[PDB]
Structure formats: structure tokens, C-alpha cells
Amino acid sequence: ATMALKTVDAKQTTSVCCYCSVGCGLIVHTDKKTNRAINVEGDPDHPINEGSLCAKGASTWQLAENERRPANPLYRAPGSDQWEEKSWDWMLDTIAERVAKTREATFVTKNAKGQVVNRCDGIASVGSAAMDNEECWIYQAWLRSLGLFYIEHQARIXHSATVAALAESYGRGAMTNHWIDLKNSDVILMMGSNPAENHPISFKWVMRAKDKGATLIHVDPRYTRTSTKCDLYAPLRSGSDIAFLNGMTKYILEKELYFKDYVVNYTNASFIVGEGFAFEEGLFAGYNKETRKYDKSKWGFERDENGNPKRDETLKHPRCVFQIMKKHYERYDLDKISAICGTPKELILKVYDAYCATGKPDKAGTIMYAMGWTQHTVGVQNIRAMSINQLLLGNIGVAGGGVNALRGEANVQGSTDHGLLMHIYPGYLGTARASIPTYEEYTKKFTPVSKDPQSANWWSNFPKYSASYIKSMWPDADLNEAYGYLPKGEDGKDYSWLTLFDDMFQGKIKGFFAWGQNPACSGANSNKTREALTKLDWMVNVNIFDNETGSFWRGPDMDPKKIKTEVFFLPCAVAIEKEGSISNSGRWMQWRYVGPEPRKNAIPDGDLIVELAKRVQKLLAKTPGKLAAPVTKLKTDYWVNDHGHFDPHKIAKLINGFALKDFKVGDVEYKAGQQIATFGHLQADGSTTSGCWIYTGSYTEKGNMAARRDKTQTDMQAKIGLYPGWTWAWPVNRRIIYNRASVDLNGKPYAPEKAVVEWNAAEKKWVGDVPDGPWPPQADKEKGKRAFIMKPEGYAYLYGPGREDGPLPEYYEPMECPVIEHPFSKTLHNPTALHFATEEKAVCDPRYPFICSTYRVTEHWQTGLMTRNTPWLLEAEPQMFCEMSEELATLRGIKNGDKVILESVRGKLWAKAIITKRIKPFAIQGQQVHMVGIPWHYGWSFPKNGGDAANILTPSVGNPNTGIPETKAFMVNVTKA
Amino acid sequence: SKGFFVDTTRCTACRGCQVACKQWHGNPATPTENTGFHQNPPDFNFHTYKLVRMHEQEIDGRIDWLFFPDQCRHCIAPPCKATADMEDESAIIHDDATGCVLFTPKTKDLEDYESVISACPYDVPRKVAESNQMAKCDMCIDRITNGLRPACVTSCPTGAMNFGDLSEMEAMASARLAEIKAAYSDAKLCDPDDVRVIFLTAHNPKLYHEYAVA
Numbered sequence A: 001a002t003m004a005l006k007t008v009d010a011k012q013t014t015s016v017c018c019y020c021s022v023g024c025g026l027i028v029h030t031d032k033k034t035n036r037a038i039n040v041e042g043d044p045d046h047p048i049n050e051g052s053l054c055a056k057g058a059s060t061w062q063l064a065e066n067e068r069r070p071a072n073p074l075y076r077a078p079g080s081d082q083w084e085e086k087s088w089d090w091m092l093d094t095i096a097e098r099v100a101k102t103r104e105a106t107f108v109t110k111n112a113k114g115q116v117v118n119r120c121d122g123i124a125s126v127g128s129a130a131m132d133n134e135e136c137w138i139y140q141a142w143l144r145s146l147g148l149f150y151i152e153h154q155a156r157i158x159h160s161a162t163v164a165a166l167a168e169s170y171g172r173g174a175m176t177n178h179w180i181d182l183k184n185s186d187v188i189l190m191m192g193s194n195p196a197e198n199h200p201i202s203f204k205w206v207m208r209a210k211d212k213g214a215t216l217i218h219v220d221p222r223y224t225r226t227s228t229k230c231d232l233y234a235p236l237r238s239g240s241d242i243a244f245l246n247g248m249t250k251y252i253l254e255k256e257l258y259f260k261d262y263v264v265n266y267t268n269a270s271f272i273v274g275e276g277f278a279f280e281e282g283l284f285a286g287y288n289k290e291t292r293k294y295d296k297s298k299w300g301f302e303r304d305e306n307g308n309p310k311r312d313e314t315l316k317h318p319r320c321v322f323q324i325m326k327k328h329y330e331r332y333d334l335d336k337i338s339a340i341c342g343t344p345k346e347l348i349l350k351v352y353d354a355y356c357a358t359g360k361p362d363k364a365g366t367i368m369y370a371m372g373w374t375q376h377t378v379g380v381q382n383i384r385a386m387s388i389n390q391l392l393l394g395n396i397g398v399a400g401g402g403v404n405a406l407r408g409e410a411n412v413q414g415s416t417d418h419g420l421l422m423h424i425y426p427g428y429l430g431t432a433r434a435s436i437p438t439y440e441e442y443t444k445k446f447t448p449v450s451k452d453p454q455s456a457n458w459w460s461n462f463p464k465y466s467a468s469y470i471k472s473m474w475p476d477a478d479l480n481e482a483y484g485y486l487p488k489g490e491d492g493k494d495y496s497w498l499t500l501f502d503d504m505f506q507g508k509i510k511g512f513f514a515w516g517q518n519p520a521c522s523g524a525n526s527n528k529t530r531e532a533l534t535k536l537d538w539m540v541n542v543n544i545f546d547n548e549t550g551s552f553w554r555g556p557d558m559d560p561k562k563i564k565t566e567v568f569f570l571p572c573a574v575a576i577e578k579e580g581s582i583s584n585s586g587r588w589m590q591w592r593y594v595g596p597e598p599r600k601n602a603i604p605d606g607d608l609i610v611e612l613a614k615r616v617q618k619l620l621a622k623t624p625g626k627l628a629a630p631v632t633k634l635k636t637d638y639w640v641n642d643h644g645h646f647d648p649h650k651i652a653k654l655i656n657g658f659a660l661k662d663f664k665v666g667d668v669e670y671k672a673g674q675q676i677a678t679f680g681h682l683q684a685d686g687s688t689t690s691g692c693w694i695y696t697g698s699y700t701e702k703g704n705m706a707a708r709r710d711k712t713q714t715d716m717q718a719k720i721g722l723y724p725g726w727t728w729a730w731p732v733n734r735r736i737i738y739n740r741a742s743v744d745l746n747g748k749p750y751a752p753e754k755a756v757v758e759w760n761a762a763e764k765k766w767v768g769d770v771p772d773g774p775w776p777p778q779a780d781k782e783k784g785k786r787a788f789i790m791k792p793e794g795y796a797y798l799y800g801p802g803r804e805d806g807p808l809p810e811y812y813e814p815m816e817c818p819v820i821e822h823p824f825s826k827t828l829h830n831p832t833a834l835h836f837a838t839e840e841k842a843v844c845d846p847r848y849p850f851i852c853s854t855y856r857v858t859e860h861w862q863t864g865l866m867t868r869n870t871p872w873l874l875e876a877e878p879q880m881f882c883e884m885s886e887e888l889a890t891l892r893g894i895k896n897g898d899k900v901i902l903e904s905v906r907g908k909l910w911a912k913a914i915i916t917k918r919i920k921p922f923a924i925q926g927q928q929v930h931m932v933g934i935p936w937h938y939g940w941s942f943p944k945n946g947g948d949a950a951n952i953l954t955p956s957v958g959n960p961n962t963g964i965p966e967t968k969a970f971m972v973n974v975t976k977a
Numbered sequence B: 001s002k003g004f005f006v007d008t009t010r011c012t013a014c015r016g017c018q019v020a021c022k023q024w025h026g027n028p029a030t031p032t033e034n035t036g037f038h039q040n041p042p043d044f045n046f047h048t049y050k051l052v053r054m055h056e057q058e059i060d061g062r063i064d065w066l067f068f069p070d071q072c073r074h075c076i077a078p079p080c081k082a083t084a085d086m087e088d089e090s091a092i093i094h095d096d097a098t099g100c101v102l103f104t105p106k107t108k109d110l111e112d113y114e115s116v117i118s119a120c121p122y123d124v125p126r127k128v129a130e131s132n133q134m135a136k137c138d139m140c141i142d143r144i145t146n147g148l149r150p151a152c153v154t155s156c157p158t159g160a161m162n163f164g165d166l167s168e169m170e171a172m173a174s175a176r177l178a179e180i181k182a183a184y185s186d187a188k189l190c191d192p193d194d195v196r197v198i199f200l201t202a203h204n205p206k207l208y209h210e211y212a213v214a
């Protein structure tokens, strides 16, 4: 009409939400005069969200345009009770000096055992899935050049179990399908997840499946916003999931609901297991009761003359995996599951019947699960059980199927891909250790061998990736010399979040980077984690807002005069003020652009890293100390433009990789300087760089695939929503991994109405998705390959002998208290767990009678630093709360909204009571077990009456006193305040 | 003229609409505390035009959680305006092209604001503290006359919010009600003949909000 839009003359750019891993597109409008955002909303054209956003994405404008962002760097001197503003130059040069001096003082060339390790033991780093891919990569590169081995972030806590379990089963740790693909599911099982709150836009697709006739199932100890939409909601006791899942396996096998052809073709069901395998009363064969470890060699497969596992494809051999499974699972009858899970038998059966109906070749069931328990001795086998069930039902590699292991942060996929974890370099390459002295030994160790020519065994390519990674960092060094620049971890020593904070507490860590994380709220046992920070000589904290970590020295019960720690707080840019990429849960690598400029005077992470690295290089170039080479030889020129600034296009091209010298591979010729087109062309001889081999193909001579916005689809692609022209997914744009298993041996789809790939015999090519493995169909004995190309034989593992606690999942009670016996064996708790009382009866303190769990709400993010500082979100969820049943509330004389005190042996906090019918006590063996729940989104720094960290109450996953939180279950009392 | 169809059976209470409305209009957050519920703020106020109401309800022995993303209904024959018109016909605009009922700042000059608020069967309009000025949902009038949909509708991920010509929305509402009437024998549309924002509920409207229907 007449009305003008606030945005008419604004600069319009695109971005991608910086909160969860759904990857929603944004449109940003920036005032050309002020360079500030005037509007931020959804991108209607983005195929995943179609312009929709949950509370969090919708609030983005408030994240950027925020007066609580410290405008200038802040320095806290030893013993001081206040921040002091300092110039960027002072801060950057000072940090550079601290890094150089502390590195030198704690650097080990040769360790006490006489091994060359070239490792810095006194500096550690956490962070961060919040950074762009190009920032994550240069960050790990910088840290490794410094000799750091303590390099961790988010992914260690919630996705390490997933990686371990799924890599065992399928060959990779990633989410197998993608968000839009959920619409193709016939049955969606959400278990150990709450996607309507934690991955909200996923519900667009989940509800689209429901519109098509899909059955939605939620299995969760609480009824949540997700539950409201489900056909079946099943409550089950915390940590009892394995019983529920193994009972499903029994049901699948006994009722013959499995998809036989798929099982024979694509799983290890036919493998003959050796005579050493056995299982008796909860223990697999090979158990050493003094070490509490298993001798896994007892579980190996029987091999033929060529060294390949023998197979009985009839699945009848008494030692074939299939028959071993039949025997193993017989104990998981329904009565037992109902008793131990607390779930009515009738309801379990409803879930089993509904879900197991997807074992038909043309049907697909999916499982959405996210964090699960953080203890691997609970989590890993639970995910394995899910993975097994999916293989038996032929659900892996098909449209609407998969293990949709939902990623957490917007770029946790990327920060994991880029090796911000102690045990892997970018591209999932194992990190060097003291007992691996030479590059030749390193490649020999990590390159698997199969003599079976029908098995792709794709990791045989390892040396191409290790050379390319090493060259991307030290391109002018030869590989043997450059390998020696990589710091080597002490043999058998854990450098993860698990022990990083314990070591910091013990005084071993002098300098610490808290880069884009808030461990004072996110680490287990906040009281002790906060005290651990006081042992540091210095900390560099890079974040959007002042926070519980950077200002730990002025937190609860702290006397600043007694805290010696020097703190450097560096205010950073927010996502819409940055250009780079982030990779979503579906592995979609998405390019984002600058809308508003970095709010004065914040600096984006990439530039902060560039500035620190260059300054430290110049100090070491003048004064080399013990070992300057890895530091000074690092090719930081690859990271910057001609003006010395962070260049995301340059870094993304390095991550993809390019030729360092002319070479030829097959029929393809490369000239020095050219981008490599696919990881299949990378070179073992040092001829190529590639910061992360899984990204080779993302940014080639044909351009930036991650910046593509092409919605063109073939009819086939459109039927299932692949959108292969929209951005780019690793590996090589295969949107549904394991897709060779969606077709028969001839290459014909099992589900013609929602086919993923199909072999075109006349053209000798696969159409639809990019085939996960491009070779001819498996029926082609001469040229074809098996479906699971990352596995050594090409078969997914039902029976998975690599897991430290057993080749098949087995139920054990996850908690000591209260004491609950289970009916599956005489082995009460996981025999590989070390934190349990064994010889004595557990001694359960009546002071802490209730189980407390921590979880999220839709409106807040992580420790809440970001969303507590976002008024619109804080308005919706302004305070720490405690959800409890009517029964418990009555027992404790609590009324709705009362302030209550939660206390555990570790500490205590207040919360506002939310009495809800959505939680009910669990009844197990004559016992009424009460579980209450709290969010972990609050912290003392803001707002004044918001509350503090749930982790004040938590212990670690193990014997550690700090570290990885067992976030799902811990003992407390709840009392009216 | 325009309308909305709000299908509460598809709402996940993601609160995208609540935030989106504020983001588009520049509305500030208002003071809240947690008093035992996830819903917040507790009610409409001068700065909050879209409010996701949330109510636990035991239905047929099973717990459920009912959501209602409340906003002005844009009444076809708006009683708020009818009342205000006795004082000043320019205080509340009734836009012919869209059907939008637009509270303007001219409301500040109304001597009798209480009568305007009480005339609303849905208890929607709200006064700012310092004067008689009142505000509420403006149907995103600027967006809808400039080729865009309302902020709340655009933001909604599950298709709970829908916007278009009134007739199309009326037809959509009726068809959707028909699709669930069997399973949800108490489902109904809320005053479908009298308002432009039409809510579908699966149970007694008053289980969603005391003022769900007139």
C-alpha cells in the first residue's frame, strides 16, 4: 500500500543459524550507513527450513545487536578484583609472550623414556564447535605447531560414544541420512532425543512424514514438547534403554522380521566367529578380573587361506554371527524388559510391532538420538544396539532410514572433522604417540589391509591423507622431518576433557585457552572445575560475552586476592558478522557471509588466530629455544590475503587441497597450484596438500560448492529431497551414506518409490544420490564392491569385536544407587567400568535419595551464555527450574513455583519448582524411584536472579573428580527453600 | 481480505512465532520470573502481541500438553473499534484491503480505554504503563502489503501458522477439522464465523485458554 518496509534500502546477505545442527538458512539486512543489522529472519528459499526458525534462530538480531558484548579486550592481573581495558596490540603481543615463554618452560623434546615427542605439556585448549570450519582448521594447525596435545572441544562430551559405536557398525561416526530425508520415513523412533525442542526445524520434516502416514514414537523418561506429536509415547527408567533395545533385537530375530537378503548381502551375519568366543553370566570370554579389561582376541573371526573371515551365507553355522545373536538375545523377553524399564509390556509391544514393520524392503524406519549418556560404558552399547536393529531391518542406506545421530552445535560436525580432539588430526587421522617414532611406522600402523578384492577397504588410502595433511601445514619440509614436528602423546596417556581438568587441578597445566567454550559451567563438578582454573598461570578466553569462565576469579566463593591467574578476555565477532563455512548434522557444508561488520571493537576468531600465530612465529624466529622449527615453519601464509588478514577462501581451498607439484593420477593431470577435485586424487608422496581429506571436492577448480544455492533436482532426487545442488555435503556430496545398501546385488532399488541410487547399466553409472562407492553393483564379482566401503571387508558389523565392552550389547545397571538388580545375568554393572563398588555392597547415602537429570529447553543454548544474554529468550525462560512429579512434590511439601534447594555431595543450588504430570516416579522391584530434572542453561554471571550451573551438582563419568559430566543421572536431595 | 488458520495440533511450542513477532516489530522483552510454568510472559502486554500459551491437561487418563499461540483475532466486526469509535474513529483503524484491525498511537488520546479493553471477547488489547496508549498484533500490516507474509507465519516450522485470503483460510480450517473430527470428537474451530484468525483445537477450547472462544 503506502507503508515502507524497515528493510527497503538495506544490504541483504545470507547466513546459517549459529545455534543447533539443523542448518537453517537466514536472511540478514544491514543498514549501509551504520553497518549494523536492522533485521534477521529466515531464508524462505533454503530447502531445510523454508524460512522457518525456532525461538533461537528468530532471536538472532538480539545476539549481534547487543550492548552486553564487551567492546574492548579486558585484562585481569594476578590477584586483581576488576577487569582493565587494554588495546588489541598490548593484548596480542602479551599473549604471544606468555605462549612463547610457557611453551618453552614446559616443552619436552625427549621424554624420560628416551622417546622424541616434541610436545608442550603445559598449555591446553578447549574450543570450539562455535567456530567456522576455516577457523577450526587453522586453530588446530596453530596449536599443533606449538606442540599442544591437550586439544579438545564440545564433541568429546556428547558425540564420542556415537563416533565409536557407529564407526564400529558402519565405518563412519556421522549422521547417516539428513534432515529433509526424515519426511521419507515410515516410522520415526525418537529415543534419547527431544527433537521438537533441541532440533526444532526437524519437526517440519517429521510432521511431513506423519502427514504421509508415518508413526511417530518417543521413548523418554519425561513427556516433552516432542511427545505431544507422537502416536506412541513410552516412558522408561533412566539408563534402561539397552534392555528396551535388546528386547527389540530378540523380537526381530525370533519373529523373523529382519530383511534376510539385506542381512546376508550387507552385514557380517554370515561371518564365522572363532571358537574362543563365549558369553557366560554377563561376561564375554577373555575377561581379566584384575585389570577389568577384556582380551578381545578371544572374539575374532575364523579366517580362510587368504586371511578373510569365513562366511556361511545360509546363516545356519552354529558360530556364524547370526546364530550367536539368536542365542545371545534369547534372554530379553518382554516381561523382563517391562520390569527393568518400568514400561508397560503392552506399550513395549506396540512400539516393537510398529517399528519392526519397517523390515520390509520398501519400508524405512529411522532412529533420532542425540546425546545419550555420557558414560561410554552405558552409551556406546546402547547406540550399538540401535545400529544392530537398523541393520537387521534393512534401514541403513535407504531413504527415510538410518541412524540419525543428531549433532549438537551448528558446527560440531566441522570442529570434529577438523580434529579439535586429542586423539585425531583433521580427517579422522589418529594422532602421533611416543611409540611411533617415524612416519613410515605411523602410516603402517594406520593403514588397514584386506586381501579381499571385492572389498573397497577405503582406508587403505590413509597415507594419501596423512601426507596431504602434513604438507598442508609444513609444505616445504619433507614428510619424515615434518612428521617429527607433530607432538607425540605419552603412550597410554589420556589428554581428553576426561583428564585435562584433573591435570589442571593437579597443577600440570600452566596456560589455557578457553576458546569459545564455558567450562566453568559445562564441565562436570563446577565447584571443582572453577577451583581448577585458579591453578593456571594464565588463561586466554575468547568469547562474545563476559562469562563464568573468563570471570571465574570473581565467581561464587572466590577471593580474587588469592587467585594468581592472569586472564586475557578477547571479545569476538558473532556468526552474522563472519564469512566462512559450517557443516550441519547432515554433513552439509554451508557458506555464510558477513552482514553487519564485527561490532566495534570485536575481532572474528580467524583473525585473532592469525594475529597470535604470526606474533608467536616472529618471537621464535628471533629466539628459537629448544625447538623452533614446527612453530616457524608452519605455513601461515596459506591462511592470509596479501594484506596479512584471515582469508576464508584461501583456507577453504587448503582444506580442500591443491597440487604442490605437477603430477598425474589415472587419466587426470594436475599442475602445481590447482585445486584437487576429489580425495580420490590425493597423493601419498607429498605432491598434494589437503587440510582435511573428507572435504576434497568442496572447493575445486570449478568453485566453492558450499556457496551453491541450486535447487535443481532430477525427478528421482526430488522424490526424496536430496537437493544435491544446495551447498555441498561430505564425502563427495553423498547425501545419504551407505546408499549402496539401498539396492540389491544388481543395483536395483529395494524401495522404487523412494530410491536413493540406481545403477544405469547402459551408462555404467549410478543415478540419484552420489553413490557411496562408485564401483559397479556387488553382483559384479570382478569389478563391483561391497556396500560398507569404510569397513575392512565391506560388510556392516552386527557383531563388532572392536568395542572394549563386548562384540554385542548387553544390559548392565547404569547406576549404583539406589540398588536395583537386573534379571539378565549375575553381572550387575558393566565389567569394564572401574568406578563401581564391587567387593562391597554399594553404600547409598539417604541424604541424596533422588535421581536428578539435566537436559535442555527450546529457548536456551548450552550453558546459556548466549541466550541468557538475549532478552527475548531470557523473557521466555528467565530462571533455573526443577521439574518434578506431583508425587515427589507432595512428599517434600513443595508447591508449584516454590524456590527449592537441590544438593548433592558436590554442591548445592536453587531452582524454581515446576510440578508436572509429565514426570512420574518409576516403580522397580517394590521400590518407588524418583527422578527430577533441571536445565543446565544458567550461570551466576547473568542475569542477577537467573541461577547458576546445574554442573555444581554433577560428578564426572568416572574416577576423575572433574571432566566429562555424567549429565543424565546423579543423586541429590530436593528441599523447599 | 485476509485471514489465518492456526492449527494448534501442529504447534510444538518452539516459540519461533513469539520471538519473531518481537524481532519484526522491535518489541522489547518484558519482566518475567518462573512461577512453575514454561509459558512466559504470563499474558499479553503492551509489548507482546504473540504469546504461546501452554497448558498441561490430562485427557482420557493420559497427560497431554496443549499449546495456543495467542494473538488478536482480527474480528470481522471488531468490538474494540466499535467502542473506541464512540470517542475517536481514528484511534483504531479497520483496514478494508486486509481486514486488519490496527490500534494506532492515537489510542493515547482515548479518555475511556477500559471500555475498549473490556469490549474484546478475547481479552487481547494492552495499555502501556505511562499513558492510555494501547497496542496488539497489527497483522504485520507492513509485510502483508509489501509482498511478504506475517513474521509469525513465516517463522513457524510445522505449518501450524497459515496465512492467506480469508476464504482460503476458512476452507483450510474446515477441511483440517474434518480430518481429525473422528479421532478428536471434541475438536472444533474457535468462532469460525466471527474472526479472521481461526484456531483449530482438538479438545474443549477452554483447556487451551480461558478466552480461546468468545
Ligand SMILES: Nc1nc2c(c(=O)[nH]1)N[C@H]1C(S)=C(S)[C@@H](COP(=O)(O)OP(=O)(O)OC[C@H]3O[C@@H](n4cnc5c(=O)[nH]c(N)nc54)[C@H](O)[C@@H]3O)O[C@H]1N2
Binding pocket: A020, A158, A191, A192, A193, A194, A195, A197, A198, A199, A219, A220, A221, A222, A224, A237, A238, A239, A240, A241, A369, A370, A371, A372, A407, A408, A409, A853, A854, A855, A856, A857, A858, A859, A860, A861, A862, A863, A968
Ligand atoms: N534448544 C537447544 N537445543 C540444543 C541444545 C541446547 O542447549 N538447547 N544443545 C545442543 C547440543 S550441544 C546437543 S549434544 C544436543 C543434545 O540433544 P538431546 O540429547 O536431545 O538433549 P537433552 O535435552 O539433553 O536430552 C534429550 C532427552 O533425553 C531424555 N533422557 C534422559 N535420560 C534418558 C535415558 O536414559 N534414556 C532415554 N531414552 N532418554 C533420556 C531427557 O528426558 C530428554 O528429553 O542438543 C543440541 N540442541
Ligand SMILES: Nc1nc2c(c(=O)[nH]1)N[C@H]1[C@@H](S)[C@H](S)[C@@H](COP(=O)(O)OP(=O)(O)OC[C@H]3O[C@@H](n4cnc5c(=O)[nH]c(N)nc54)[C@H](O)[C@@H]3O)O[C@H]1N2
Binding pocket: A018, A128, A130, A131, A154, A155, A157, A158, A371, A408, A409, A515, A516, A517, A518, A519, A521, A522, A523, A542, A543, A544, A545, A572, A573, A574, A575, A605, A854, A855, A861, A862, A863, A864, A865, A866, A936, A950, A951, A954, A965, A967
Ligand atoms: N550437566 C550437563 N553438562 C553438559 C551438558 C548437559 O547436557 N548436562 N551438555 C554437554 C554438551 S553436549 C555440550 S556440547 C557442552 C557445551 O559446553 P560449552 O561449549 O562450554 O558451552 P557454551 O560455552 O555455553 O557454548 C559454546 C560457546 O560458543 C560461544 N560462541 C558462539 N559463537 C562464537 C564465535 O564465533 N566465536 C567464539 N570464540 N565463541 C563463540 C558462545 O558464546 C558459547 O560460550 O556442555 C556439556 N555439558
Ligand code: SF4
Binding pocket: A017, A018, A019, A020, A021, A022, A023, A024, A049, A052, A053, A054, A055, A056, A057, A058, A198, A199, A200, A201, A202
Ligand atoms: S536453533 Fe536449530 S532449528 Fe532453531 S533456527 Fe537455529 S538451526 Fe534452525
Ligand code: SF4
Binding pocket: B072, B073, B074, B075, B078, B079, B080, B081, B101, B119, B120, B121, B122, B123, B124, B125, B136
Ligand atoms: S480480538 Fe479483541 S482486540 Fe483483536 S479485533 Fe477482536 S475485539 Fe479487537
Ligand code: SF4
Binding pocket: B020, B021, B022, B024, B049, B050, B071, B136, B137, B138, B139, B140, B141, B150, B151, B152, B153
Ligand atoms: S501477524 Fe504479525 S503482529 Fe500479529 S502476531 Fe503474527 S508476527 Fe505478531
Ligand code: SF4
Binding pocket: B010, B011, B012, B013, B014, B015, B016, B017, B018, B052, B067, B069, B152, B155, B156, B157, B158, B159, B160, B161
Ligand atoms: S512458530 Fe509454529 S510451532 Fe512454533 S510455537 Fe509458533 S505456532 Fe507453534
Ligand SMILES: [Ca+2]
Binding pocket: A259, A358, A359, A360, A361, A362, A363, A364, A365, A393, A394, A395
Ligand atoms: Ca527396511
Ligand SMILES: [W+6]
Binding pocket: A154, A155, A157, A158, A408, A409
Ligand atoms: W553437544
